[PDB]
Write an enzyme that holds these catalytic residues in place. Sequence first.
Site, PDB file in Angstrom:
ATOM      1  N   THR A  39      49.820  50.903  41.568  1.00 56.65           N
ATOM      2  CA  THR A  39      51.172  51.713  41.920  1.00 56.65           C
ATOM      3  C   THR A  39      52.035  51.848  40.883  1.00 56.65           C
ATOM      4  O   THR A  39      52.232  50.552  40.003  1.00 56.65           O
ATOM      5  CB  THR A  39      52.006  51.123  43.033  1.00 56.65           C
ATOM      6  N   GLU A  59      41.910  45.713  35.598  1.00 52.95           N
ATOM      7  CA  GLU A  59      42.315  46.564  34.436  1.00 52.95           C
ATOM      8  C   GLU A  59      41.691  46.144  33.052  1.00 52.95           C
ATOM      9  O   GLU A  59      41.462  46.872  32.231  1.00 52.95           O
ATOM     10  CB  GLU A  59      43.932  46.784  33.996  1.00 52.95           C
ATOM     11  N   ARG A  64      56.036  51.315  34.440  1.00 53.68           N
ATOM     12  CA  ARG A  64      56.602  50.469  35.701  1.00 53.68           C
ATOM     13  C   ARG A  64      56.784  48.925  35.266  1.00 53.68           C
ATOM     14  O   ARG A  64      56.400  48.690  34.220  1.00 53.68           O
ATOM     15  CB  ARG A  64      55.323  50.348  36.670  1.00 53.68           C
ATOM     16  N   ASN A 100      47.145  47.030  50.608  1.00 55.26           N
ATOM     17  CA  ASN A 100      48.453  47.473  50.103  1.00 55.26           C
ATOM     18  C   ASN A 100      48.514  48.624  48.955  1.00 55.26           C
ATOM     19  O   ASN A 100      49.518  49.454  49.473  1.00 55.26           O
ATOM     20  CB  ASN A 100      48.841  46.320  49.202  1.00 55.26           C
TER      21      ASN A 100
HETATM   22  C1  LIG Z   1      46.712  42.993  37.157  1.00 56.47           C
HETATM   23  C2  LIG Z   1      47.125  43.886  38.437  1.00 56.47           C
HETATM   24  N1  LIG Z   1      46.256  45.032  38.594  1.00 56.47           N
HETATM   25  C3  LIG Z   1      46.375  46.005  40.040  1.00 56.47           C
HETATM   26  C4  LIG Z   1      47.620  45.457  40.581  1.00 56.47           C
HETATM   27  C5  LIG Z   1      47.798  46.566  41.728  1.00 56.47           C
HETATM   28  N2  LIG Z   1      47.593  45.858  43.120  1.00 56.47           N
HETATM   29  C6  LIG Z   1      48.333  44.735  43.923  1.00 56.47           C
HETATM   30  S1  LIG Z   1      47.602  44.132  45.251  1.00 56.47           S
HETATM   31  C7  LIG Z   1      45.960  45.032  44.927  1.00 56.47           C
HETATM   32  C8  LIG Z   1      44.971  45.012  46.102  1.00 56.47           C
HETATM   33  C9  LIG Z   1      45.256  44.085  47.249  1.00 56.47           C
HETATM   34  O1  LIG Z   1      44.095  44.018  47.791  1.00 56.47           O
HETATM   35  P1  LIG Z   1      43.723  42.716  48.459  1.00 56.47           P
HETATM   36  O2  LIG Z   1      43.490  41.572  47.507  1.00 56.47           O
HETATM   37  O3  LIG Z   1      42.413  42.915  49.153  1.00 56.47           O
HETATM   38  O4  LIG Z   1      44.747  42.425  49.442  1.00 56.47           O
HETATM   39  P2  LIG Z   1      45.442  43.287  50.885  1.00 56.47           P
HETATM   40  O5  LIG Z   1      46.460  44.099  50.537  1.00 56.47           O
HETATM   41  O6  LIG Z   1      43.867  44.031  51.088  1.00 56.47           O
HETATM   42  O7  LIG Z   1      45.728  42.212  51.757  1.00 56.47           O
HETATM   43  C10 LIG Z   1      46.118  46.116  43.703  1.00 56.47           C
HETATM   44  C11 LIG Z   1      44.924  46.806  43.180  1.00 56.47           C
HETATM   45  C12 LIG Z   1      48.669  44.369  40.239  1.00 56.47           C
HETATM   46  N3  LIG Z   1      49.506  43.939  40.765  1.00 56.47           N
HETATM   47  N4  LIG Z   1      48.311  43.439  39.179  1.00 56.47           N
END
Ligand SMILES: Cc1ncc(C[n+]2csc(CCOP(=O)(O)OP(=O)(O)O)c2C)c(N)n1
Lengths: 117, 1231, 235, 59, 118, 58
Positions: B30, B63, B113, B995
């Site tokens: 995000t 990333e 961000r 999320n």
């Molecule tokens: C280095 C980094 N890359 C991407 C994000 C964005 N991000 C935060 S949580 C997330 C996915 C969460 O997936 P999951 O681990 O399955 O937990 P859920 O929300 O499904 O419980 C992503 C892509 C971040 N905060 N930090």
Amino acid sequence: DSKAPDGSVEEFLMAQNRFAVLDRSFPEDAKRLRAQVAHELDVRFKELEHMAATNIFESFAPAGGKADGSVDFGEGAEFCTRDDTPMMARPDSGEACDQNRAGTSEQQGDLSKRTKK
Amino acid sequence: GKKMMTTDGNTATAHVAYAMSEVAAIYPITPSSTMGEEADDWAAQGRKNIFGQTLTIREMQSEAGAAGAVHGALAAGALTTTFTASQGLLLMIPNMYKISGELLPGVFHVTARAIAAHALSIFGDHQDIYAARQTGFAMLASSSVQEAHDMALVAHLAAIESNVPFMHFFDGFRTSHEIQKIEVLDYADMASLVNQKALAEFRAKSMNPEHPHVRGTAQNPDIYFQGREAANPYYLKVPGIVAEYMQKVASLTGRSYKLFDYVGAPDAERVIVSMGSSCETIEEVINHLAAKGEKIGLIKVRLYRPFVSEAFFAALPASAKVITVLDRTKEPGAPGDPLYLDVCSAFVERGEAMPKILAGRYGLGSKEFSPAMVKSVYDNMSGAKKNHFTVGIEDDVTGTSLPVDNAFADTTPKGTIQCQFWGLGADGTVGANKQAIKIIGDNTDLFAQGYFSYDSKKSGGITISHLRFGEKPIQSTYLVNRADYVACHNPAYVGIYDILEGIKDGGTFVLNSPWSSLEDMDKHLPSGIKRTIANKKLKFYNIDAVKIATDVGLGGRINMIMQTAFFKLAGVLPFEKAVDLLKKSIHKAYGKKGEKIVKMNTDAVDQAVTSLQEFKYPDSWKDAPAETKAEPMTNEFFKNVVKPILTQQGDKLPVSAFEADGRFPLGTSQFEKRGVAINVPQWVPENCIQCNQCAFVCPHSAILPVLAKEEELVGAPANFTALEAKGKELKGYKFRIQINTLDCMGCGNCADICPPKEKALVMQPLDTQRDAQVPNLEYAARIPVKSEVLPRDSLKGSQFQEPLMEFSGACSGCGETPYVRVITQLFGERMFIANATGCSSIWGASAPSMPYKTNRLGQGPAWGNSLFEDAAEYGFGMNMSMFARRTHLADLAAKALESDASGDVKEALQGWLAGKNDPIKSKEYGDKLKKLLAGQKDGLLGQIAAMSDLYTKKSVWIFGGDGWAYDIGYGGLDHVLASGEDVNVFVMDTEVYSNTGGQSSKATPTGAVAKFAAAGKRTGKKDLARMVMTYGYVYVATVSMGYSKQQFLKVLKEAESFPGPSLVIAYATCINQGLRKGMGKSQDVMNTAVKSGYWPLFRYDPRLAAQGKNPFQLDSKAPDGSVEEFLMAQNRFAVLDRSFPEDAKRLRAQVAHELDVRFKELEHMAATNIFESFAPAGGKADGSVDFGEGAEFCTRDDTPMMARPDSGEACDQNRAGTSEQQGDLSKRTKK
Amino acid sequence: GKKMMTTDGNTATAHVAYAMSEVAAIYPITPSSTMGEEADDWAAQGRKNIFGQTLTIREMQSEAGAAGAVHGALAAGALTTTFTASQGLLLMIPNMYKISGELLPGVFHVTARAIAAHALSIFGDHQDIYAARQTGFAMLASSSVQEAHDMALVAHLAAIESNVPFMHFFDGFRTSHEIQKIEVLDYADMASLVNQKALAEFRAKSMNPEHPHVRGTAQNPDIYFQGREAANPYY
Amino acid sequence: VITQLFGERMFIANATGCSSIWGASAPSMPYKTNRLGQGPAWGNSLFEDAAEYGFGMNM
Amino acid sequence: GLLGQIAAMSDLYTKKSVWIFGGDGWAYDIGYGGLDHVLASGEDVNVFVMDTEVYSNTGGQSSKATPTGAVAKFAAAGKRTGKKDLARMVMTYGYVYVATVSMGYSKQQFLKVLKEAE
Amino acid sequence: KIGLIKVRLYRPFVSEAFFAALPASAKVITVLDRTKEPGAPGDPLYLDVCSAFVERGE
Ligand SMILES: Cc1ncc(C[n+]2csc(CCOP(=O)(O)OP(=O)(O)O)c2C)c(N)n1
Ligand SMILES: Cc1ncc(C[n+]2csc(CCOP(=O)(O)OP(=O)(O)O)c2C)c(N)n1
Ligand code: SF4
Ligand code: SF4
Ligand code: SF4
Ligand SMILES: [Ca+2]
Ligand SMILES: [Mg+2]
Ligand SMILES: [Mg+2]
């Protein structure tokens, strides 16, 4: 592609300083650790033999096939598939949907029946 | 060709990125996620780039993985791009040095961000882009939605010709999510601007075995420096190339740009230098103030890197006496922020006139940067001239903030109509607003702007829409604070929020409520609102949207009714035409299921119009009697911090209100009592079997089992019905299931699984239960929880324990929270939680709501969210601390035993030492020491007494979702489990990145539809469990609450008690999965997941192997053949069947085959007699030895990398052959 | 005392780091590797830090893992350190914002080394340390072997009392591997300079279920900015 | 041996380490072209991203 | 025209062989997450891991590929955890070709693996 | 007549301490940076020093 341990592992290990040096400094621990390695490879080779003898392996069904186009996971869903936060907001989001605050379909239907009026 | 359209910053940017790129390696974050998702959709839809090809896009594990893939694609000659921000951009930094270092034409599109420091923020500021300013990437900023499109194109064209990679950025949310009517170019036009010669040279110099080269060499001091300077000519040419393309693009669009542009009075004496969306608002203010004679101006920074002073001075009015440089970031300890420092250097080098230069900080984490604030900035330059200031906050701690007079007049262009809409989550308000923008934008010459503010609460949250329409361009990059139209789509808001704040006199206020009669309106509408309406002569309208919606058969959905209200009373368009478009669009849209649906909405409009009549209110309203504060009792923190924040007053809290390190106290969610459930369960004692299953399953802890003695129910309410406790151990006690109606989310899971066919729990309308249950819950809460009656780890006994995570902001029916709540009922008082970023960190700690709380003794989970990628390592660190500190305590205890300490003390010390790693014994003796050593402050006993919080054995847990465990955090998870240390990992597997918007993860199953798997994932679910079981010394188990609450409890005890690493993977239902009958079927879904064989349960316990037994144990049975119905009952699979039935069938068949083979593999594992052994320790001793000690030949090379303080002694370097060969040669050379 | 002995920049620094730390999460990277190896060998030999305890040191899977572990150890009340450089330091940047953002007394000892761009280099320059200048870490430079020892000590003592993490750095090879006759202090002397009250306060505010708190919240636009500025007094 | 079988048409994404050091420490480049000028297209990105780097070449 | 564009793409005619080279430190530790993801992708790439059972270039530090009892830096009294089984972990995918070789044992098995893996 | 200002504490950068070490007689000052930030108007230490003089306003 190889055969069961021939029993020369002890010599193999002691012919390398990364192992022998320990035997010279901490003989008791070393003796124990070299025996542990011998046991580890024994178990592992047996597990590999088991893998090779098994009649159950990971096979795959035909396939999925070409798919011209795609679809969003929320399309045509009965209840909301996205929350109301900034993180799930998308250009095409914002439509009304059942947010699961009134119970399951059957529970809502039953309540309707029980309320009729 | 051109083309007008209403779209957001992300889409405007993606429009260009798709056309100009051949490859894209992405990862979701995000607020940049939209760009990658659109790119994938467009590729699937058949969209072609400038080369006539569909974009080749792939999702990586993080990333860092995306940046490496981007580097590889560019090195191999493919135009590549990626989309990222914040934490994501940071992980790309290492590759950025390589990409610019190798002069590759890459382009990164970043939604700037905030970076997570004292706290995480998904909002916009330049903390991320400034963190990569030294990587060698050119940096080009966009200050508006229109500029997002334009600068994206300039970036790509310039990168190709210059060979210097570009970072095109725009403000997170403020620009990325703002909607504006803009003009975009078609792909053919973009392609016509590409430098073909440069493109050919790019292909030719790229990696290829037909004409190979070596890249990425390692260089010594003799040539590295020269090599680093060889690219200078390329960077010297970048600015001219950027100017070249701004001009070439301008020749097609008519919109010109310079590296730095100036707006305002030509003879300005006070000038601001800014970058990003703030420039739009600043120019708006300049137009207003300059028209009054103020000599002010602004320099907009387009190209931040390279920074060309010549171009900066070209935009600087020689008449400038004071200049304020605004930075949207904070670099602690620096003498100034980045842009400020760059500007200072330009003046220093110029060596001529030196105007007064001031540094100012603004907009961190999307903090408002309003016209009033801009006014403060200009007034500051003619007034106090405070330097290194902040604006938008009240810094009563260090006094760096500028005062802001919010009385500043509206600065929007004449004719601009501003609107605000207060809606309830999922009521369709946002959707209607977006349609209104498109309708008006496509059928008029008016400009349109849209920006939405959402709630942190995932269900029943508040959404505030800000829309603007005008004859002139809208540069208002700030919220609407003086609206002409204000609508409240949820009557509940009338008495909780200040919905009429700032509304213009004579403005229109539309309210949705059933209070048609004046008696009812006077009964509900607060005095404050009445007085405001009368005093401002507002045009008040009240409409019973629910009634109108039901009558027309729309089921009660108000979205279409309130939409009509807007089109009729907003005044953006004439009634006639206004209602015209709305109807024509109803046919445009919908027009699906016959005319039956098309007619209902059409009628809704007709009825709405007829119903929308100006509510006539008396003059007495002007001075209505002020009510009285009837607020309950809450904490001092809730009153002074939480409440203000929850009521939209957070911006008013000064810096002094917060902790320097960002910490928050536990339990603030206890006082929220939102009461947003539509229906809540009603307990029917006559049918209740006293099983506590309902409370066990609740995703919000809204069910409180009560077990009290007769004497404890004396002053109990009349309707506080209780049953005589069943069970031999509960003889004499009274039992009651108390429903928390205000914290309940109305999911229905409890009533759904209540055992008795004659349900003891029946869902009913909230308004029929609250009056009686609210006071009942209050009384129940004062009843001591009987946690000593039944075994803590038993199904029923667990619910007699204090739950330490309650009323979180998770969705109604969330499949993650039930598991966590129970874990706290078993270990809550002594656990540490290292939580990976994701849904669990969001419902777990979104300020100001903290669901984790303490028990009656003040003990509770020590919770922390470091980052997304490091949860396992973060927890491992907590474990390391406890080890080091408790070992210290142990050494002190041992020394104390060898002293004249009393008999009782020594007795306790020996006891603690003997059971320090046992939860029971450690607490037993630890508590004795606390008493025995109370008051001791000297010597050894003094030290031991001060370490009481280290006495009881702690339980370190690592919480995270599947995305964390299977993808980004996998490397760390793997390493931590391999360590053999005592930590517990609990993975909430939703089989998708929940999320961030439902993106595919390696935990996503075959055939499931998700972002980046929009045609059904074509690779099976990664088998994390089996991979980890190969270690042999790690406890591994899978659970599913719906299938067995007992197995889940058994797993928790076994995993936690294992003296080593434990991994527990739970099946977590999620709204992203699209459960057909509601999330209230979660338990049923979890149950079927196991029975169908889709999610088999098992346990791998190493200690069984230590005792000669097979560590692997299967807890579920062979597939019962219900997989097909299991899958089709979820939209994530069903939607594919409806769209691609043939592929879907094969994909579901694939799943059935996979689980069939896997279960058989598990059975074989359980039947094996060959298993890895287990041993906790067996050595340590004391001392160390180097691997090269006593070696016959050199064990280290002669390079700088292996050099060590004690290295350098002579040795055989293997250049004379083996020992035998040397000996044989010596014999042969006798002589 | 003041007994001159010959040693290199790395050893002079590790000498201090070991004494002033309780936990270390490490990962190897030239030219800082020597410090971690020395710390591990000394711990194995049973060398005691100022608290009379052997250092608890573990090797992670990468510097990102090491930084995450350092953050967790510090969050849980243990004085912690690590040794790194170049590419490794870059991987620690995300956690660096977190360690400073949470005002934790961590100390990084860095052998300043070139960043890999047109080519890789294991040699010395300030490209790495400057890449982390905005993370909120205090930055203290050593210009000689003698200063490597002295500044390493100042960094640890100041981190403990100020609650602001420190990055103590010295030139890769030119200082880390230069040998000089210098003076190093014994551990008792180093211990005598520690602000024991600050240390006790560090322990008391750390993570513990006996007196829990929430750290790492997610904040909206209404309060994030205020929260970011709240640490000003400490800096 | 690997180059003797696929050398003329291979790309190599090399992780940092001994193989990248004996593989490309300036100015000594051991990888070479065959008589037709074909040879391994070699590259070292970083220590941590070798697989992803190669994956990008593939894309 | 078209023939001109095609003629300019001759270095793309022959199917190429993409290889990823790395040591055990890379494969078992720092680069593991990436290696895992890439193998899971199912695309045509070849990974060759030269397992020295230690981080060699930097000075012989232990890696998860280091065996029980081996002495190395950070394993100063002999490593006390066994060698990570990267091979068996990756075989769980079912769609990834996995093989181990040792030149001194069989040059033919090594050649067969190269042909088959590629 | 030449001199040198040695930087010990780079962050936080205290301008008052920098000036306390600068001879009033200094007419020319060279700031040496051991890095390279391509495209920057100058490297880190130089930019910090420049800001000190701009803020002093003397
Ligand atoms: C280095 C980094 N890359 C991407 C994000 C964005 N991000 C935060 S949580 C997330 C996915 C969460 O997936 P999951 O681990 O399955 O937990 P859920 O929300 O499904 O419980 C992503 C892509 C971040 N905060 N930090
Ligand atoms: C992020 C990062 N951390 C650490 C290093 C230092 N480093 C380079 S290669 C290496 C180990 C190489 O070990 P391995 O992968 O086993 O290959 P070998 O040298 O044994 O062939 C280390 C620790 C680096 N270059 N980048
Ligand atoms: S309906 Fe859902 S939120 Fe409400 S008490 Fe039942 S399980 Fe809990
Ligand atoms: S689930 Fe039903 S039967 Fe069981 S305790 Fe709850 S209300 Fe009673
Ligand atoms: S895991 Fe799914 S159901 Fe739970 S809070 Fe997240 S999006 Fe909502
Ligand atoms: Ca455990
Ligand atoms: Mg998930
Ligand atoms: Mg190796």
